[PDB]
Design a protein around this ligand. Structure first.
Ligand SMILES: c1ccc2[nH]ccc2c1
Ligand SMILES: c1ccc2[nH]ccc2c1
Ligand SMILES: c1ccc2[nH]ccc2c1
Ligand code: FES
Ligand code: FES
Ligand code: FES
Ligand SMILES: [Fe+3]
Ligand SMILES: [Fe+3]
Ligand SMILES: [Fe+3]
Lengths: 447, 193, 193, 447, 193, 447
């Protein structure tokens, strides 16, 4: 398949070929053009706060060690010994000043440097160039209010610029709330879906909630429950959708601060967010203060998703075209009382974790849609993402990005897939920019 | 019995549980516990979830299944949350899960799932302090089969506390499972262990 | 116990079986049933098929294993054959299967197969009407291993009826299995559950 | 591999390269040139008799919904939602006026049409082109006496023409018997063999019966049992073999109406078929009446096989080069007494179903022959199908097709594989016809 | 019971073992054996290897697990080594294995492994000649889980001899397993069955 | 990937691309250029001593039958029926005058010839060319002191020449000891590693022993135990490393006759080898007699490894790039007492068999190093084998081959991988020779 010319995503992101969820050659190509090119979630400050603390994380199919340095910075390295390539670290988290290889005993520091080699003098004499034998380092590591991302490409735009217009929406909760913490360890489960299936679902899919989650809505009695079984749709002005140049996007459901939480937490949360909102009105304005306590369903391109307020934080780690390893953390506001932090974290897992009853509702949808992408008669078929097309705007006076002023639509799918075409058909970051020079015009076309 | 300074791989928690069962053996209690667990598993296997709640689960129940993060056996400095709760349910939370299972719009339950449970290695010991309470340990293999060719098998050890109840109806007041697989390869863990 | 109008996922058949075992408990009967099934499984595991037929299987036996078609939980109009019989054997039909297993030209039995069976969750209750008959429920995990790297594991629940027989030799008069996997991934189901 | 030029099947079908049973690139190519081009078994009238009745079936690796329309016709559609591609129907059979997608709730009628979209007016307004959003329809659906077949290619020949010379042999049992019913549901088992291995076995392999099935013959005491262990061969005139232009073929074993049934059914069946035969003598002639009560082992190209009289009906559903999902139904004569219908169906499953003792005898043969096709030193080796070559005839005055007037031979393999070369090396139905213009001459060559 | 001339697939060894258990049944002994094996498996599952050695394993122990070469069922001429010993350990050799498991430089044990054992089909019979010795047969499913996504499941039947010991502490004097899979698909067999 | 030009192994074997342990296209290419070209271990005389005795063995991914002929020779044939390709023999060993196919009953002799076909006269008449239908024969089968190897390529050099300089080192134990026997049956276990990972470990890796096997050394109390945890390194003159033209190589640890055996066997073995050594001094000289009782860790290119004295004999049978089936036998000296033979065999399995505690230490090393070869950021990374480079010699007056006069180094890796480049980049044996005409110069370069 010639990725320079193949139309995998139509103009304006209106449709995508179903094969993108099943083609293994394309998956291999995404390793290069998506995962080795873009910003990927690694960890949070709250998980590695002290010097020597480390965690392992995936970046695409690669595994890296993410380590807090003595100077307070964070560096990340491939979890692969420079000698004969054994995996260096076999645990998920810890504290150490270095890592020693269990094969021949080479010892690397938390800074990636080759520090010791068994019997170096008797064996290598002075012939070993240790300075050129440090662990392979992740070129770029940057923080968005404690959330640490990595990128293998030195040509990538800075993380803040990469978030583009989505950043404005995240800032009330990520910055002005006083800060978030990630509660680990994450749940980890393998699903038989392509990584794009959950990514697209979280980036822009409010349409599925009432039907897919009818049973969960009915049973949990959460605030969004009026939608169970499409018994009712919300108010035209119940929310909005947005997308951005580099692919990130989100849905906004006004005021839904308790999110997917069952009625047992709704009162405490609605009180907490409302009180903080009242203070934020004076600091960032009424609109941004309301955004703080509004439910955002977001995907940070390519494979990091979250539900603010609900506090669900996901990484869709690719394994192959029909396999993904799902990591689920909870996000909590740092100044929430400890007991509320604990209950919210359990509720995140209760709804969206390994035994999450809401997440279970989505399984078959993601898995079968992905697997059908392999089936002969569906490969060349078109997945549709035209809902709301030609009503999106950009450069709005209040809400930035390409924006659909409706709660339910497919604006965010269109922006995600537009960014995806541009990457798959480009050899580098300069070519992606050239392919994206009229990104918002392409997305708003007929309006 | 065990000395964890010598038996270096054994946790203090695990050593306490062995002590509990090796001491006084009450053959009749073992058999009663075996029957109780077999009946509970039968109710679950036929998806009689409301009956399970009514006949087997106490109002004060804590139903907990954890996933522990992989850490170095020699770790001793890193002190942040060691596990996470796949389940950590009170009675009302179990009831929500049961209602979800029985809702006719739970699309994932059509066609009907098939469950088969295998309970083994049953041990039972009375609580030293609370005479209403019985400690029961058992291991479970749980087989789920759905949608023609989906098959998921779960394996675990269960540390339970059951109360005598009224009328001979013993009820679960605590179930604790430390799930042995860190990364699940069963699509989800939406089963009652 | 169960009310299937409330416990919406439970079939009338399944609810009848729970009623049968929850009522009168006879500890001695449970243990006798456990021994009987363990002995039967031992004979099968060593491929003593003629001995199994002679010592464990009654002349009036119905040995039945079904595969049910996947239908919507909300279905109520489509009324055509719901299942099919993987096995539905009388004594003579079992004997034909045993002769096939023992024939020296059964090429698939060389090299010799290896079987290991795990029987759990045994429950037993006397029939209310026929005092020669005992209801026994049990679950089986059956592991087959052949030809170096072929491994097939079977899982099922068995609903049996055994007759007292003569001389203390209890014999199977009915075995019913509703096989939980609709599409088999074990090459075949040519094993005695 | 260049399929235009590669000789996978030698001239006259005398041999085939062993790689055809193991090569995954070829399997992918067969999806296009075999499964998307030819007629595939779907279901029987007896399984979907009433309006709204439906079943799911595979067509190659694709899954389709097969539905009885209100006007009495049958239409089939891909089991894939037109929105984001989720599998629509998760059950195997039922009755419904439509199918609703569990993802976002789109509702399609039994006629494939998009009938409802949740909140269509508030979301899509009048912008949604529902008329162009019906389920993807199987182009061709035709019946052979109640047996329903589908074809994705509008250029295919009609089903009756596609059956060619084999149809004459099937007609006594399928038409003149008063009609057959298929007894469902089928057994379903995965085997680690290529779909062609069982297809070729059933189309033309009587040679294996005495040896492969020695134990089953000996134990079951069926009518064919004299052959156990090759203790004896039948009479030169005990049967015949035939093959046809489009690949279908069969063996005929004269008078073997009880087929593989154990002695418990032999008397009742031999009485039933003999009585019907006596009536058919006057209607269709002695030869065709005898064919009615003669055992036919047939494959309807490419992957549908059956044993008439025994009543075994199989679909060899391809999964990959060394994986096939086997579906087993029983066929019964409609005017047989109900109790006999029930016993015959159980006997079909007893012998050839998931725990079929005869089918078990064939497992290792099919699996190892298929898997050996992947082994380096066997890929380019030649599988032989020369038995009987240069004694076949065509245009015989009594028995049509390319015919070997012997019970045991490889005539039917040669015709099956000739049709297979022609398809794999052709881009369309016109090219297959051009490649097949001297099909029977190629098959009878040296005679 | 069995006649191996008629039951053609049965080995003389297997037929001798059936004879041993079918004869005298001692219900109390079966229950005692069940408790013993459940306790042993608990110690192993928590990786209390030193405690297992001290509390469950006799000084005269032979701990043997064989792998038999695949031969034709009709073979009768080829007479060379029929099996090989995956394990054939005396007490000191078991102790070496236990020390290896507990060494802090056993890198493969970090992060800590997780074991779950399921013991079923327990049968027990006293030795006819040596009154200190009890024959116990049982089947085991052993589940190993390590390093996030490594899962290995073992299946086997165990033929044991246990001595009464002193103080009610029964100890294993012989364990024999004929491992049913000829080519292991579990990375190794480094587990105590 | 163009194997003619791709540098997979750098000059002088100093490094290799990590992808060689994970690339499936390369694995397929090795089937042709490594496994179908070179000498592969089959069995030992001691396992098939009498006429009619046979065993099955793998040669790459192919399976062969290895059979003792009536004249005392050994011939090997593909385990595939010449008719329709079923696997002929389903057992691992036995005694027979022929093999009959379970599909249609064709019977082949122990000499590969098609001897009988069921009903040949009635079916094939005189048309069947049985003389051209013998089993596909392994072109070359040769013995090295009872150890039987096969090669599919008639152009291969004789086995003795192929062993090159390594043969001199093996001869004291394989020839002058009076001969070895292989004790079967082997242990068989699948590991998720590339076949090259254990091959390289055994050919030249003494560096790992102290660290990888720290726990085994400590627990078993074997003679090499002073190295546990790198507590100490041996004496500069404690051994040597060597490699040869065709890829075979080994480490030599002077005097270590009890090898990996726990203290329970150390005294008996050290007595036995020392007594034989004293007799060999007069026959082959002091140096070669010492070699006899010195521990050799060797790989006979490509995938046969052994530890003399320890008596460990391995075949690393390839399944795919990250799957290998490990066969473990014990080697014993024929004139050892029977009881010592039995104990040594059990000890071989105790340490290196399916439940071998030493072999367990190596699992993760081999598996993760292999699997990391598939990971995107590691594919193009370099595995290092430079230890000792520019201190190797060749044409030494006492010790032949390319030799590193140190116990621990990477000489043998360099020679193994040099031979590997040469094969992967060559179409035949003549091209390999052309590519290898300055093999030892390339390996000793900077000295
Ligand atoms: C609430 C609202 C919108 C959403 N999109 C994906 C999950 C989700 C939850
Ligand atoms: C009877 C006769 C011929 C046959 N070919 C395949 C099955 C079969 C059964
Ligand atoms: C002893 C010495 C060196 C070695 N290399 C690989 C195994 C081994 C054992
Ligand atoms: S592979 Fe890490 S030290 Fe050798
Ligand atoms: S995928 Fe079917 S309605 Fe959206
Ligand atoms: S495949 Fe061997 S005789 Fe036909
Ligand atoms: Fe959802
Ligand atoms: Fe057959
Ligand atoms: Fe090693």
């Amino acid at each position: 398949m010639n990725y320079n010319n193949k139309i995998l995503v139509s103009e304006s992101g209106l449709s995508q070929k179903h094969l993108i969820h099943g083609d293994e050659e394309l998956f291999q190509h995404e390793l290069k053009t998506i995962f080795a090119r873009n910003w990927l979630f690694l960890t949070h400050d709250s998980l590695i706060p002290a010097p020597g603390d480390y965690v392992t994380a995936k970046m695409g199919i690669d595994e890296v060690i993410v380590s807090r340095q003595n100077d307070g910075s964070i560096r990340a390295f491939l979890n692969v010994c420079r000698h004969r390539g054994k995996t260096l670290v076999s645990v998920e988290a810890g504290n150490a000043k270095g890592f020693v290889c269990s094969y021949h005993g080479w010892g690397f520091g938390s800074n990636g440097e080759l520090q010791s080699v068994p019997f170096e003098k008797d064996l290598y004499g002075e012939s070993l160039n240790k300075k050129c034998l440090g662990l392979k380092e992740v070129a770029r590591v940057e923080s968005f209010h404690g959330f640490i991302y990595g990128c293998f490409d030195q040509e990538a735009p800075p993380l803040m610029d990469y978030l583009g217009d989505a950043a404005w929406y995240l800032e009330p909760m990520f910055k002005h709330s006083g800060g978030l913490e990630l509660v680990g360890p994450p749940g980890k489960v393998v699903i038989k879906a392509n990584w794009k299936a959950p990514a697209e679902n979280f980036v822009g899919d409010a349409y599925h909630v009432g039907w897919t989650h009818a049973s969960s809505l009915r049973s949990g009695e959460s605030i969004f429950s009026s939608l169970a079984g499409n018994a009712a749709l919300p108010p035209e002005g119940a929310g909005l959708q947005m997308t951005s140049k580099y692919g990130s996007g989100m849905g906004v459901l006004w005021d839904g601060y308790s999110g997917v939480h069952s009625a047992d937490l709704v009162p405490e949360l609605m009180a907490f967010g409302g009180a903080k909102q009242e203070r934020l009105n004076k600091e960032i304005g009424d609109v941004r203060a309301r955004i703080y306590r509004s439910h955002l369903n977001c995907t940070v391109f390519p494979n990091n998703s979250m539900l603010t307020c609900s506090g669900v934080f996901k990484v869709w780690n690719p394994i192959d075209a029909n396999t993904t390893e799902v990591w689920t953390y909870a996000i909590v506001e740092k100044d929430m009382p400890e007991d509320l932090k604990r209950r919210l974290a359990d509720s995140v897992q209760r709804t969206f974790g390994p035994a999450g009853f809401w997440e279970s509702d989505d399984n078959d949808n993601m898995e079968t849609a992905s697997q059908n992408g392999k089936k002969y008669q569906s490969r060349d078929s078109d997945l549709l993402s035209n809902l709301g097309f030609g009503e999106d705007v950009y450069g709005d006076a209040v809400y930035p990005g390409v924006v659909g002023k409706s709660a339910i639509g497919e604006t965010s799918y269109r922006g995600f897939y537009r960014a995806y075409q541009a990457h798959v058909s480009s050899s580098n970051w300069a070519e992606f920019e050239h392919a994206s020079s009229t990104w918002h015009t392409e997305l708003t076309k007929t309006t | 019995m065990i000395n964890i300074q010598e038996d270096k791989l054994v946790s203090a928690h695990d050593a306490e549980e062995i002590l509990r069962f090796f001491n006084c053996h009450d053959s009749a209690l073992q058999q009663e516990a075996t029957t109780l667990l077999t009946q509970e598993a039968h109710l679950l296997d036929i998806q009689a979830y409301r009956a399970w709640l009514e006949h087997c689960v106490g109002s004060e129940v804590q139903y907990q299944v954890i996933s522990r993060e992989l850490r170095a056996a020699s770790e001793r400095r890193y002190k942040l949350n060691e596990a996470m709760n796949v389940y950590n349910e009170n009675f009302q939370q179990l009831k929500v899960r049961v209602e979800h299972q029985l809702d006719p719009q739970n699309w994932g339950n059509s066609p009907k799932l098939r469950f088969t449970r295998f309970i083994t290695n049953v041990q039972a010991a009375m609580d030293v302090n609370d005479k209403e309470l019985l400690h029961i340990r058992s291991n479970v293999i749980l087989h789920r089969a759905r949608r023609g060719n989906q098959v998921d098998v779960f394996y675990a050890a269960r540390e339970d506390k059951w109360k005598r109840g009224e009328g001979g109806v013993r009820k679960l007041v605590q179930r604790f499972v430390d799930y042995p697989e860190r990364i699940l390869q069963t699509h989800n863990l939406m089963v009652f262990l």
